[PDB]
Design a protein around this motif. Structure first.
Motif, PDB file in Angstrom:
ATOM      1  N   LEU A   1       0.775  -1.232   0.000  1.00 57.79           N
ATOM      2  CA  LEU A   1       0.000   0.000   0.000  1.00 57.79           C
ATOM      3  C   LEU A   1       0.811   1.288   0.000  1.00 57.79           C
ATOM      4  O   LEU A   1       0.601   2.283  -0.716  1.00 57.79           O
ATOM      5  CB  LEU A   1      -0.897   0.048   1.214  1.00 57.79           C
ATOM      6  N   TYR A   2       1.769   1.172   0.905  1.00 59.99           N
ATOM      7  CA  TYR A   2       2.679   2.250   1.179  1.00 59.99           C
ATOM      8  C   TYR A   2       3.575   2.557  -0.023  1.00 59.99           C
ATOM      9  O   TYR A   2       3.857   3.711  -0.354  1.00 59.99           O
ATOM     10  CB  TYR A   2       3.430   1.816   2.420  1.00 59.99           C
ATOM     11  N   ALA A   3       4.004   1.528  -0.729  1.00 63.37           N
ATOM     12  CA  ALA A   3       4.754   1.693  -1.957  1.00 63.37           C
ATOM     13  C   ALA A   3       3.876   2.372  -3.019  1.00 63.37           C
ATOM     14  O   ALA A   3       4.406   2.920  -3.995  1.00 63.37           O
ATOM     15  CB  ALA A   3       5.202   0.325  -2.481  1.00 63.37           C
TER      16      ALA A   3
ATOM     17  N   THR B   1      -1.771   5.377   2.756  1.00 64.75           N
ATOM     18  CA  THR B   1      -1.850   4.768   4.069  1.00 64.75           C
ATOM     19  C   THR B   1      -3.156   4.134   4.467  1.00 64.75           C
ATOM     20  O   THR B   1      -3.217   3.417   5.460  1.00 64.75           O
ATOM     21  CB  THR B   1      -1.522   5.773   5.135  1.00 64.75           C
ATOM     22  N   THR B   2      -4.189   4.436   3.709  1.00 65.55           N
ATOM     23  CA  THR B   2      -5.488   3.819   3.874  1.00 65.55           C
ATOM     24  C   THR B   2      -5.824   3.417   2.455  1.00 65.55           C
ATOM     25  O   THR B   2      -5.550   4.129   1.478  1.00 65.55           O
ATOM     26  CB  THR B   2      -6.568   4.780   4.383  1.00 65.55           C
ATOM     27  N   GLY B   3      -6.328   2.192   2.434  1.00 65.93           N
ATOM     28  CA  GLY B   3      -6.768   1.510   1.242  1.00 65.93           C
ATOM     29  C   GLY B   3      -7.013   0.054   1.562  1.00 65.93           C
ATOM     30  O   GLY B   3      -6.940  -0.347   2.716  1.00 65.93           O
ATOM     31  N   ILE B   4      -7.358  -0.777   0.597  1.00 69.90           N
ATOM     32  CA  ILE B   4      -7.499  -2.202   0.849  1.00 69.90           C
ATOM     33  C   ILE B   4      -6.633  -2.849  -0.240  1.00 69.90           C
ATOM     34  O   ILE B   4      -6.659  -2.433  -1.392  1.00 69.90           O
ATOM     35  CB  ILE B   4      -9.058  -2.526   0.820  1.00 69.90           C
ATOM     36  N   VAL B   5      -5.725  -3.743   0.145  1.00 72.78           N
ATOM     37  CA  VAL B   5      -4.869  -4.421  -0.820  1.00 72.78           C
ATOM     38  C   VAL B   5      -5.425  -5.801  -1.190  1.00 72.78           C
ATOM     39  O   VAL B   5      -5.779  -6.585  -0.296  1.00 72.78           O
ATOM     40  CB  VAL B   5      -3.446  -4.601  -0.241  1.00 72.78           C
ATOM     41  N   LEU B   6      -5.571  -6.105  -2.487  1.00 73.37           N
ATOM     42  CA  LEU B   6      -5.867  -7.462  -2.874  1.00 73.37           C
ATOM     43  C   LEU B   6      -4.474  -7.962  -3.192  1.00 73.37           C
ATOM     44  O   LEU B   6      -3.827  -7.511  -4.144  1.00 73.37           O
ATOM     45  CB  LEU B   6      -6.703  -7.537  -4.123  1.00 73.37           C
TER      46      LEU B   6
ATOM     47  N   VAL C   1      -6.397  -7.065   2.540  1.00 69.49           N
ATOM     48  CA  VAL C   1      -6.037  -6.558   3.859  1.00 69.49           C
ATOM     49  C   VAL C   1      -6.403  -5.101   3.859  1.00 69.49           C
ATOM     50  O   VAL C   1      -5.694  -4.306   3.224  1.00 69.49           O
ATOM     51  CB  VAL C   1      -4.519  -6.677   4.174  1.00 69.49           C
ATOM     52  N   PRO C   2      -7.511  -4.745   4.537  1.00 70.04           N
ATOM     53  CA  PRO C   2      -7.980  -3.377   4.661  1.00 70.04           C
ATOM     54  C   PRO C   2      -7.026  -2.711   5.638  1.00 70.04           C
ATOM     55  O   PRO C   2      -6.768  -3.279   6.714  1.00 70.04           O
ATOM     56  CB  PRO C   2      -9.373  -3.554   5.166  1.00 70.04           C
ATOM     57  N   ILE C   3      -6.417  -1.563   5.274  1.00 61.90           N
ATOM     58  CA  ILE C   3      -5.486  -0.844   6.154  1.00 61.90           C
ATOM     59  C   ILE C   3      -5.951   0.584   6.390  1.00 61.90           C
ATOM     60  O   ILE C   3      -6.271   1.288   5.439  1.00 61.90           O
ATOM     61  CB  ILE C   3      -4.117  -0.868   5.515  1.00 61.90           C
ATOM     62  N   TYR C   4      -5.978   1.050   7.635  1.00 58.28           N
ATOM     63  CA  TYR C   4      -6.424   2.404   7.944  1.00 58.28           C
ATOM     64  C   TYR C   4      -5.339   3.158   8.703  1.00 58.28           C
ATOM     65  O   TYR C   4      -4.980   2.811   9.831  1.00 58.28           O
ATOM     66  CB  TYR C   4      -7.721   2.355   8.790  1.00 58.28           C
TER      67      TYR C   4
ATOM     68  N   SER D   1       5.653  -4.935  -5.422  1.00 57.96           N
ATOM     69  CA  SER D   1       5.152  -3.844  -4.576  1.00 57.96           C
ATOM     70  C   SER D   1       5.596  -3.926  -3.140  1.00 57.96           C
ATOM     71  O   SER D   1       6.186  -2.991  -2.613  1.00 57.96           O
ATOM     72  CB  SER D   1       3.673  -3.825  -4.535  1.00 57.96           C
ATOM     73  N   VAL D   2       5.338  -5.120  -2.603  1.00 59.76           N
ATOM     74  CA  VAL D   2       5.719  -5.518  -1.271  1.00 59.76           C
ATOM     75  C   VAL D   2       7.166  -5.163  -1.033  1.00 59.76           C
ATOM     76  O   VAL D   2       7.456  -4.457  -0.075  1.00 59.76           O
ATOM     77  CB  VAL D   2       5.574  -7.031  -1.073  1.00 59.76           C
ATOM     78  N   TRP D   3       8.069  -5.577  -1.942  1.00 63.47           N
ATOM     79  CA  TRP D   3       9.494  -5.413  -1.732  1.00 63.47           C
ATOM     80  C   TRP D   3       9.885  -3.946  -1.785  1.00 63.47           C
ATOM     81  O   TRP D   3      10.667  -3.459  -0.962  1.00 63.47           O
ATOM     82  CB  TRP D   3      10.265  -6.244  -2.800  1.00 63.47           C
TER      83      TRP D   3
END
Ligand code: CA
Ligand code: CA
Ligand code: CA
Ligand code: CA
Lengths: 159, 141, 372, 90
Positions: free
Chosen positions: C142-144, C148-153, C163-166, C338-340
């Motif tokens: 997400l951060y990449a 900072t808020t969103g939901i990642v598939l 993973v919904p992130i807030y 993305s993760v990396w």
């Protein structure tokens, strides 16, 4: 212990002598090692204000026996690493400065012209061949100039 | 088979050292001269103050200064910020080089702790006699 | 520089490891997450007896070894074999000594507390790294993508997740895991391609079905009238040339494979599919945060790379979401890393230094310290 | 690329407006009114100079922050040349 080796190999009796006197003052009780608290006291006398985290990190940097304390051996190691880093910083700083003096035109380089000047500016007697020779030996990327990196390299050793 | 070639290299060194040696002595020249400029600049922008008469003057002057203070202070602030901006710009550049080379010489930020020579002086005061730098010590004569 | 250069980022997957230095734009090292153990005694010419093989040497020599996968569905299942993959990563792949490099690692969405403590125990106590840190994978993705808020598939080789992130905190109770990913997807293509009248008989036939899936597979929008299109037989077909001449043709199945991600029923799965699951995650979250999650569906993972995945998802959730809502499916190009990349950014960052778990923290607080 | 125009406005205006008040907050603190007005006559004397020093104080710092940026600006020029030199896409 292998470190405590070259470390003591590095220093001189003189060194050890003083680093001891110094270590002793670190060590309050006089037991044989600086604790996470004995260190804190000296740090403040030295003008700092470390935090528990900060202190330990500084401790377990040379704590090979997982003691959580520092003995006159682990200490000498520590002094050594420092001695090293100090001398390195002072060196690069000086050279860094020298490069700015030699640069003056501030293009971030040192062209055969400036090299000549600065060289000719020394007392020494030199003919163009010398100058261009030193350029050719220093300029590794064969671009004509001498970049800071190259300057570090070329001056590597020289005093 | 280039037997003499050895003398050529020594020359570059002899010269390199003639250069550095030159550098250092020039380095402190620019340094002090620099300072001179600093005291002249300050020489006119804030010359040896001379307290006026007594009535309106002292008050006036005081008001004069006090206002300038907010002025200079603001400028001082703007400057500090342009510095921040700058230091920032080079930290990023001090990155674009790391992950493209690795740890390289002379990082611009330089994280430095106090030297051992300092700590030693600080703790033993008078008796700290060792011009430590690198010179090892092996039996003389 | 001490550690500006020096921070390592290791993303442990079910299929691939991605590794490299914080600072770089992409992983310096990418390789299978296998550990091969030789079925017989003997040697290669010029080498000694090897007890074990990791990554590509395990894949290449698979005929004489028993291959094992340490990470089942994103979770580390065998710790003897994982310490082997880490060892390989530091010493052979990145060729660094670990005891002078801070190491940012990643874990999975609802990774058991005890595991995050165990890999910390192994990082500090058997590799002796100066400091380390475990980031959650969707959170780095997400951060990449800046936010900072969103939901990642998130979808890779063995797991899919939502993973919904807030404001940075991944929301435990709204996370969904669907165990069908790129691995499952290569094996389904395999069958619809043998079923097209073919044979992936030798191991040089097996492996390349996966390279067909990656190169030629599509996620069509209106998968309905795409089958219909297949039938009129347009120039929709696509022939791939095998290791040899044997030109194989794939017209249609090309998209029947990623339609598996929306219809798990294609593979005898009774679970719901990617888009419904995006949605269900979302109607499991607080009400006031649901407009945010909807405008920030970030995609990451190798299996979300199928072209037209984003358009299908776009329309899949618009048509399930209340019309008053703004839908927005972000799918960046570098998404297979993305993760990396999120880890590289974060760990090279100026403010992260104060979250590194140091050996000082550890030797003093136990594995609990990093566990949070 | 014109959908990003609304990003310019929001972004710039945002950051710039943030910076402003901060500068105001900061600068305001470091400011203690000239409250002392008509409380004594020789006071002005012992007062005026104190202000004078504070000014000189700030002035001197401003000069240093200044020379500093210049030096840094040069660190950059060089640090940029090292970046290009260290390119070699080879
Ligand atoms: Ca003690
Ligand atoms: Ca000890
Ligand atoms: Ca120049
Ligand atoms: Ca050059």
């Amino acid at each position: 212990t292998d470190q405590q080796a070259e470390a003591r190999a590095f220093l001189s009796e003189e060194m050890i002598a003083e680093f001891k006197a110094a270590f002793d003052m670190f060590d309050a009780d006089g037991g044989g090692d600086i604790s996470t608290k004995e260190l804190g006291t000296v740090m403040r006398m030295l003008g700092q204000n470390p935090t528990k985290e900060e202190l330990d990190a500084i401790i377990e940097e040379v704590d090979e026996d997982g003691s959580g304390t520092i003995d006159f051996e682990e200490f000498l190691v520590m002094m050594v690493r420092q001695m090293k880093e100090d001398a390195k910083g002072k060196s690069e700083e000086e050279l860094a400065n020298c490069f700015r003096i030699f640069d003056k035109n501030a293009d971030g380089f040192i062209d055969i012209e400036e090299l000549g000047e600065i060289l000719r500016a020394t007392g020494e007697h030199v003919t163009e061949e010398d100058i261009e020779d030193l350029m050719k030996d220093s300029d590794k990327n064969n671009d004509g100039r001498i970049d800071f990196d190259e300057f570090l390299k070329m001056m590597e050793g020289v005093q | 088979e280039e037997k003499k070639r050895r003398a050529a290299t020594a020359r570059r060194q002899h010269l390199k050292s003639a250069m550095l040696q030159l550098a250092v002595t020039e380095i402190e020249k620019e340094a002090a001269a620099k300072e001179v400029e600093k005291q002249n600049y300050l020489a006119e922008h804030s010359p040896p103050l001379s307290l006026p008469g007594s009535m309106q003057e002292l008050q006036e002057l005081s008001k004069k200064l006090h206002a300038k203070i907010d002025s200079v202070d603001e400028e001082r602030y703007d400057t500090e910020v342009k510095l921040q901006k700058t230091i920032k710009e080079l930290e990023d550049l001090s990155q674009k080089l790391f992950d493209l080379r690795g740890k390289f010489k002379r990082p611009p930020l330089r994280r430095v702790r106090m030297s051992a020579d300092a700590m030693l002086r600080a703790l033993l005061g008078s008796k700290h006699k060792v011009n430590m730098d690198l010179r090892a010590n092996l039996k003389q004569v | 520089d001490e550690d500006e250069t020096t921070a390592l980022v290791c993303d442990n997957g079910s299929g691939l490891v991605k590794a490299g230095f914080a600072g770089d734009d992409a992983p310096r090292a990418v390789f299978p997450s296998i550990v091969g153990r030789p079925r017989h005694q003997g040697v290669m010419v010029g080498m000694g007896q090897k007890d074990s093989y990791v990554g590509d040497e395990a894949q290449s020599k698979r005929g004489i070894l028993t291959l094992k996968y340490p990470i089942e569905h994103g979770i580390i299942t065998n710790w003897d074999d994982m310490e082997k993959i880490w060892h390989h990563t530091f010493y052979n792949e990145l060729r660094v000594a670990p005891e002078e490099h801070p190491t940012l690692l990643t874990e999975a969405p609802l990774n058991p507390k005890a595991n995050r403590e165990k890999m910390t125990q192994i990082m500090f106590e058997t590799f002796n790294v100066p400091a380390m840190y475990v980031a959650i994978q969707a959170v780095l993705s997400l951060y990449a993508s800046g936010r900072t808020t969103g939901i990642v598939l998130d979808s890779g080789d063995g797991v899919t997740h939502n993973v919904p992130i807030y404001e940075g905190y991944a929301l435990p109770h709204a996370i969904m895991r669907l165990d069908l990913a790129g691995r499952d997807l290569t094996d389904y293509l395999m069958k619809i391609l043998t079923e097209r009248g073919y044979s992936f008989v030798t191991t040089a036939e097996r492996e390349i079905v996966r390279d067909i899936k990656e190169k030629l597979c599509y996620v069509a929008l209106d998968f309905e009238n795409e089958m219909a299109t297949a039938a009129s037989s347009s120039s929709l077909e696509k022939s791939y040339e095998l290791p040899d001449g044997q030109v194989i043709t794939i017209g249609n199945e090309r998209f029947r494979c990623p339609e598996t991600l929306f219809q798990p029923s294609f593979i005898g799965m009774e679970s719901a599919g990617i888009h419904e699951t995006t949605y269900n995650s979302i109607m499991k979250c607080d009400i006031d945060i649901r407009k945010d999650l909807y405008a920030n569906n970030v995609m990451s993972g190798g299996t979300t790379m199928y072209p037209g995945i984003a358009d299908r998802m776009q329309k899949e959730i618009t048509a399930l979401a209340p019309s008053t809502m703004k839908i927005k499916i972000i799918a960046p190009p570098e998404r297979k890393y993305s993760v990396w990349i999120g880890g590289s950014i974060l760990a090279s960052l100026s403010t992260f230094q104060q979250m590194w778990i140091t050996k000082q923290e550890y030797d003093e607080a136990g594995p609990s310290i990093v566990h949070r | 690329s014109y959908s990003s125009y609304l990003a310019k406005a929001d972004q710039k205006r945002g950051k710039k407006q943030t910076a402003r008040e901060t500068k105001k907050k900061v600068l305001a603190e470091r400011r203690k009114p000239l409250n002392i007005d008509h409380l004594n006559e020789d006071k002005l004397r012992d007062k005026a100079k104190e202000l004078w020093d504070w000014l000189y104080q700030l002035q001197t710092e401003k000069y240093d922050f200044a020379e500093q940026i210049k030096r840094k600006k040069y660190e950059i020029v060089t640090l940029r040349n090292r970046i290009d030199q260290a390119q070699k896409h080879s």
